[PDB]
Amino acid sequence: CSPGIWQLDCTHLEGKVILVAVHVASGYIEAEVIPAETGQETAYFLLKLAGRWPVKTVHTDNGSNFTSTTVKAACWWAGIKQEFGIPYNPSMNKELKKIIGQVRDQAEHLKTAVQMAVFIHNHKRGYSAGERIVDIIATDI
Amino acid sequence: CSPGIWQLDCTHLEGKVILVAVHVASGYIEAEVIPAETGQETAYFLLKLAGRWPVKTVHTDNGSNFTSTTVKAACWWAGIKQEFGIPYNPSMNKELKKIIGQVRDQAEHLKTAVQMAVFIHNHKRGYSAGERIVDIIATDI
Ligand SMILES: Cc1ccc2c(c1[C@H](OC(C)(C)C)C(=O)O)[C@]1(CC2)CC[C@@H](C)CC1
Numbered sequence: 001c002s003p004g005i006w007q008l009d010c011t012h013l014e015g016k017v018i019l020v021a022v023h024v025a026s027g028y029i030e031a032e033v034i035p036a037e038t039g040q041e042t043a044y045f046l047l048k049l050a051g052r053w054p055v056k057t058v059h060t061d062n063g064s065n066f067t068s069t070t071v072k073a074a075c076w077w078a079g080i081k082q083e084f085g086i087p088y089n090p091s092m093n094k095e096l097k098k099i100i101g102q103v104r105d106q107a108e109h110l111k112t113a114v115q116m117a118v119f120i121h122n123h124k125r126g127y128s129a130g131e132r133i134v135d136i137i138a139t140d141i
Numbered sequence: 142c143s144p145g146i147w148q149l150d151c152t153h154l155e156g157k158v159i160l161v162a163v164h165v166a167s168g169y170i171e172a173e174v175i176p177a178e179t180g181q182e183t184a185y186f187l188l189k190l191a192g193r194w195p196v197k198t199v200h201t202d203n204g205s206n207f208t209s210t211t212v213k214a215a216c217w218w219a220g221i222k223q224e225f226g227i228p229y230n231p232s233m234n235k236e237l238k239k240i241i242g243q244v245r246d247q248a249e250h251l252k253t254a255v256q257m258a259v260f261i262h263n264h265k266r267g268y269s270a271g272e273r274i275v276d277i278i279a280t281d282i
């Protein structure tokens with residue numbers, strides 16, 4: 001609901017790892033294939049994300065993702081706090097996997113199809129996710 | 142001046158290649174270390190960028206960057222045209238290298254320092270580049 005909240009999760013496809021970041025208020029997605037589920041990969045991704053968008057808090061469906069000192073150092077440097085207002089009651093990852101499968105045959109590498117699917121998701125329409133995120137953030141200013 | 146214009150260039154540091162994308166109207170930067178100056182690296186970067194921002198035209202200071210069929214295919218799929226309104230009369234890359242040098246000792250890897258410098262650049266103040274780009278794009282809507 002708030003404009004600075006992002007949710008980060010990893011999902012798996014074709015034996016590879018996809019890190020998926022969702023801007024909760026807009027549905028806008030940032031995703032990319034990473035070599036492994038490691039603290040260093042998560043930390044580097046957070047640093048990239050935080051330099052491109054105003055990231056205030058981060059949530060996840062796997063709390064242990066954020067236990068490594070390397071991730072904690074990346075949140076510390078970027079001024080990112082953990083999100084505590086989003087409960088866990090056991091979506092976009094399935095929508096993303098659906099789009100990836102639709103375009104998968106158009107690219108050789110999974111990482112390319114992932115970026116094609118991010119493009120499709122963020123620009124699909126009644127605004128698009130890419131339109132909503134900028135309107136939410138700009139309005140917050 | 143127009144909200145869909147980006148300029149892409151590669152610069153070199155520590156024997157590595159930095160791809161730098163600048164949103165011309167705002168000064169907002171996206172940058173990352175890439176293994177080599179190749180058409181495939183440029184194409185993948187453009188696909189990523191185009192899924193995150195509304196990219197209409199792309200300029201560069203090295204026209205031959207955009208001659209590979211692989212880059213042409215990435216522009217074709219994302220609907221990106223070449224920018225023809227920005228002449229070439231022989232800046233941000235120097236500002237970026239300045240910031241990188243300031244933070245370089247705080248990280249082991251150059252790629253990390255680059256993302257730290259992107260963060261510093263985009264959030265430095267009279268708005269910041271990250272504030273201007275969202276205001277420009279949102280206003281365009
Ligand atoms: C390797 C490779 C070779 C050639 C082409 C592609 C690629 C993709 O890999 C890179 C993004 C790293 C260049 C891929 O994974 O096939 C295109 C078309 C032409 C790029 C644009 C895409 C929209 C379609 C796939």
Ligand SMILES: Cc1ccc2c(c1[C@H](OC(C)(C)C)C(=O)O)[C@]1(CC2)CC[C@@H](C)CC1
Nearest residue numbers: 040043044070073074077247248249250253
């Ligand atoms: C390898 C490595 C190991 C440990 C730490 C870091 C790193 C950096 O590399 C990754 C971003 C890939 C994790 C680096 O290049 O040193 C930090 C602190 C702790 C991450 C946060 C940064 C703001 C400072 C450097």
